[PDB]
Design an enzyme around this catalytic site. Sequence first.
Site, PDB file in Angstrom:
ATOM      1  N   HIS A  71       0.794  -1.224   0.000  1.00 24.69           N
ATOM      2  CA  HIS A  71       0.000   0.000   0.000  1.00 24.69           C
ATOM      3  C   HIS A  71       0.831   1.282   0.000  1.00 24.69           C
ATOM      4  CE1 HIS A  71       0.691  -1.245   4.232  1.00 24.69           C
ATOM      5  NE2 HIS A  71       0.958   0.040   4.384  1.00 24.69           N
TER       6      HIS A  71
ATOM      7  N   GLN B 168      -4.356   4.513   3.895  1.00 24.90           N
ATOM      8  CA  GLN B 168      -3.401   3.578   3.306  1.00 24.90           C
ATOM      9  C   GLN B 168      -4.038   2.776   2.178  1.00 24.90           C
ATOM     10  OE1 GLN B 168      -0.230   3.784   4.092  1.00 24.90           O
ATOM     11  NE2 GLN B 168      -0.703   5.298   5.683  1.00 24.90           N
TER      12      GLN B 168
ATOM     13  N   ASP C 143       7.809  -5.333   3.657  1.00 20.07           N
ATOM     14  CA  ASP C 143       6.756  -5.136   4.643  1.00 20.07           C
ATOM     15  C   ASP C 143       5.373  -5.410   4.050  1.00 20.07           C
ATOM     16  OD1 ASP C 143       5.486  -4.531   6.986  1.00 20.07           O
ATOM     17  OD2 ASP C 143       6.267  -2.488   7.158  1.00 20.07           O
TER      18      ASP C 143
ATOM     19  N   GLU D 244       8.734  -9.826   5.470  1.00 24.33           N
ATOM     20  CA  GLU D 244       8.052  -9.531   6.723  1.00 24.33           C
ATOM     21  C   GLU D 244       6.675 -10.161   6.680  1.00 24.33           C
ATOM     22  OE1 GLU D 244       5.309  -7.283   7.441  1.00 24.33           O
ATOM     23  OE2 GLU D 244       5.501  -7.213   9.625  1.00 24.33           O
TER      24      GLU D 244
END
Length: 589
Positions: A133, A196, A228, A270
């Site tokens: 995002h 986001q 991430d 992640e």
Amino acid sequence: DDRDAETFRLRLERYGPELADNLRAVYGNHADALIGELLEVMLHAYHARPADLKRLDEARLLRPDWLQGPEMVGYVAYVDRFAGTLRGVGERLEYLEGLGVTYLHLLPDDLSALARELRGRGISLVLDLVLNHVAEEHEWAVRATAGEAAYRDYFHIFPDRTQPDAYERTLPEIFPDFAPGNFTWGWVWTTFNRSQWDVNWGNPAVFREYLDLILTLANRGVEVFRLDAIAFLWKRLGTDCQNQPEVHRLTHALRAATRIVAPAVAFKAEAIVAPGDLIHYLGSRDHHGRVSDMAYHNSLMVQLWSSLASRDTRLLTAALAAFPPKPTNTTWGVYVRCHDDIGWAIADEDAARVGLSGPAHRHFLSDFYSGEFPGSFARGLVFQHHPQTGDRRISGTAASLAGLDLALETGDAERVNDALARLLLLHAVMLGFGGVPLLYMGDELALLNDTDFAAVPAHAADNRWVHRPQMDWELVASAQQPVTPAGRMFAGLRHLLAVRRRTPHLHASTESRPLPSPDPCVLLLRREHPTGVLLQVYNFSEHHITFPTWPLQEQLGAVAHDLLGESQFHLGGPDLALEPYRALWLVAG
């Protein structure tokens, strides 16, 4: 040059087919047109890559297991909470090198320079990169709200919400009879915050954009990319829109491309999910070892704190045994604490195998590390109460959780000694497990909870700032025959690090396997490295154990050599003593 063009051609003949296959797998007929584009993006990146980073590339092709050596030591820290800005980080490098740090994870021109200095000191820059995002103020979102159909297809927009509540059926919601869902007003997909916006990975343009981002960031000097929120990047109706196979195909593609342009860089996925789901992030099937290089070993961490709290290592060995083997070219990121809170990731099956429950053991862990348990040394806080499951995340520094915080206010030297022994124990297990150890900033000084975190209004809400303190360099300089707790922790950890750097057995290629123990308090970890069997022994209790030598005897022979204490003892005599929180790294003596 002809040499560079030839090199590129060879790399493309190598990794090209991997890249093309995955793209054709998820984009179908739109793949060809994208491949031609990526070719240009790769070529531009490759020829713009600095000579020193090209030398790094070649070097890392000579040593594809650079992340695996026992010399690798990680250090995770917020940039501002460590040295204000990047330049200050540049001003505090002799410290990091003094520790032995080679892997520097910095949590969110100047960056380029910092990277240059880091590589100068043999340290790899590791940065976060969110794959799922972007902010609503980001260029793509602004262009989208401008009415450009091109930059609106970078996201997931919807006219009427006939499609949103179609996904929402299989989407996991925090609360049933409510709607704090995953959409924001058309209707834009927002899995996290309202600001986001999720990017549409079904559009080749966003793949190209993200690859270009990765490559230019790599050319700035970034050597390891923490990907991430990699779990959410693919969305399919009728699913939880997490951990989808398209995610690993796209990751494989990105990875191959990067392996062509920049051989020196590596990916760290992640993804805090179950082991069965997590193992795919290191690559299953045709993706085997061909995706992200690293992944976090969250299970080992929750089991470390669990076993430390219960003085029983049956659940830890259980959970480790049911953990899938990683591809031998991939490397676990291992840790004791980090910036985040602690979620008690315990499997009900894992607990069931050792005659435990699960929810009541999670209740146990929360009660203990919040400070509500009789005989608890933990001085942690409660971050969030989980809505219906009742689980509790726990905030707190490694030192406060291990009992030093309580030990200091009640000037009992015994409690302090025990606390330091506990912390050194945890760090000893991490440093000798296999994989780059991720020292959280301050733990080498046994930093206590920053309860004045509320002094900053921005930090006032999120109590995780109780374990995200500002680096006091006077404290550092002072702590650096110690009498200071910080000094003693620093010394112990320095020793552990030296011993690790020596020990060839701790090469990440070889995994730690759990061995059954006669005493629940004692944890036995076997590492069968080509050079010799390394048997790790840990006392997870404050007891003086009388341990039988036979489990060591049938592993190392009649004579054993301890790498940690430089001791060398015989395994014939029936028993040997383990002092509270003792850690042994035994080899054939």
